[PDB]
Design a protein around this ligand. Structure first.
Ligand SMILES: CC(=O)N[C@H]1[C@H]([C@@H](O)[C@@H](O)CNC(=O)c2ccc(-c3ccccc3)cc2)O[C@@](Cc2cn(C[C@H](O)Cn3c([N+](=O)[O-])cnc3C)nn2)(C(=O)O)C[C@@H]1O
Ligand SMILES: *[C@@H]1O[C@H](CO)[C@@H](O[C@@H]2O[C@H](CO)[C@@H](O[C@@H]3O[C@H](CO)[C@@H](O)[C@H](O)[C@@H]3O)[C@H](O)[C@H]2NC(C)=O)[C@H](O)[C@H]1NC(C)=O
Length: 307
């Protein structure tokens, strides 16, 4: 009994004040249409074996001459298209819509769910699983809404400030999926680790509607800071010098630590402190530590000993 076959999304989302555009097609194997009624939450009376409830559209009354001012409009034909449109949609419209249709001696009822919330629902940011420094990533912000009579826009904010990188916004309004996607590419620095990325929903005039925030987990090599005593780095032979190596940032945590004298690894220096108890003249160069993690080896600044 596959007499009727409808192609449309199973659920359409919107909010109070906006509009909703419902794509819909059908194929009636039993000729063209004779009547089309649009119920809101129809209740089937088991006694009379008919459908009751508030009728939002009747093809025999408010659809005999299309009014163009109608809030609820049927944009379809007699045997193919059942695209509905409520502009503006209200909270009292949220529910289950019924597409009661009749042809020659047979009739059919079709359900469409219309979820309308009082406030604009937030979008959603889809992050890559591993974000690493100097590697371009594509952040995806999706929104399960798109209507013609109410244009929207998605805005990317980093740390509460718009991002200079351009985005690409695309909308799909088909019988399969309805959404507004905005993708943004940018090469993250190590400092972006722990920073907040926001995707804001705004109308045509740019008024804030909703948003979704995330915190970046940017892998990076250990950024190091080196200290030396004395600060002036001046000494005589035999006297002591101490250098310290402090990991200021590393994602993930560090693994090994070694020291370098003009690019030469001093052996047995597996700690963050470099003690030169009795110095000479042949030393006196440029020192730096190397701390690594899963990401790789990170190097600190250079200090001129010069003795
Ligand atoms: C080709 C054909 O044969 N077409 C049938 C047609 C169904 O095939 C067709 O409409 C399929 N779609 C549904 O069924 C349907 C049901 C509910 C909803 C919906 C939508 C929005 C909100 C709430 C609901 C949308 C679709 O059905 C009838 C009557 C008919 C009467 N019943 C009673 C039966 O007990 C099951 N039932 C009960 N109940 O409590 O049992 C409560 N409501 C029902 C249907 N079951 N069919 C009709 O005239 O529409 C005859 C017609 O010739
Ligand atoms: C069922 O029939 C209706 C009526 O034609 C179809 O609706 C029409 O669809 C087109 C494209 O989908 C709409 O064009 C759009 O216009 C806006 C401006 O309002 C523009 O910004 C878009 O880029 C696009 O050009 C059109 O407005 C819309 N309505 C009417 C009255 O024409 C509907 O597509 C049909 N259903 C299916 C599943 O095809």
């Amino acid at each position: 009994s596959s007499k009727w076959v409808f192609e449309h999304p199973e659920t359409l989302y919107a909010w109070e004040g906006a509009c909703v555009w419902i794509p819909c097609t059908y194929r009636a194997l039993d000729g063209d249409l004779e009547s089309f009624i649009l119920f809101h939450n129809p209740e089937y009376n088991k006694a009379t074996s008919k459908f009751d409830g508030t009728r939002l559209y009747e093809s025999t009354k408010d659809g005999k001459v299309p009014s163009e001012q109608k809030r609820v409009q049927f944009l379809g034909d007699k045997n193919k298209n059942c695209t509905l449109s409520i502009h503006p949609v209200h909270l009292a419209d949220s529910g289950q819509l019924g597409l009661r249709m009749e042809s020659k001696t047979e009739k059919w009822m079709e359900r469409i769910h219309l979820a309308v919330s009082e406030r604009p629902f937030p979008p959603h940011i889809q992050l890559p699983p591993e974000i690493q420094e100097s590697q371009e990533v594509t952040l995806t912000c999706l929104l399960a809404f798109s209507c013609y009579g109410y244009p929207i826009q998605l805005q990317w904010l980093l740390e509460g400030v718009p991002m200079r990188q351009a985005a690409v916004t695309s909308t799909s309004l088909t019988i399969k999926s309805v959404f507004t996607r905005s993708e943004l590419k940018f090469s993250p620095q190590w400092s972006h680790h722990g920073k907040i990325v926001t995707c804001q929903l705004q109308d045509a005039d740019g008024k804030f509607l909703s948003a979704d925030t995330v915190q970046l987990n940017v892998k990076h090599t250990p950024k190091l800071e080196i200290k030396v005593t004395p600060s002036d780095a001046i000494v005589r032979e035999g006297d002591s010098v101490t250098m310290t190596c402090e990991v200021s940032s590393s994602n993930p945590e560090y693994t090994t630590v070694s020291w370098l004298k003009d690019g030469t690894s001093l052996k047995k220096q597996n700690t963050f402190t470099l003690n030169l108890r009795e110095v000479t003249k042949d030393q006196s160069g440029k020192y730096c530590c190397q701390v690594s993690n899963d990401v790789g080896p990170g190097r600190s600044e250079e200090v001129f000993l010069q003795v």
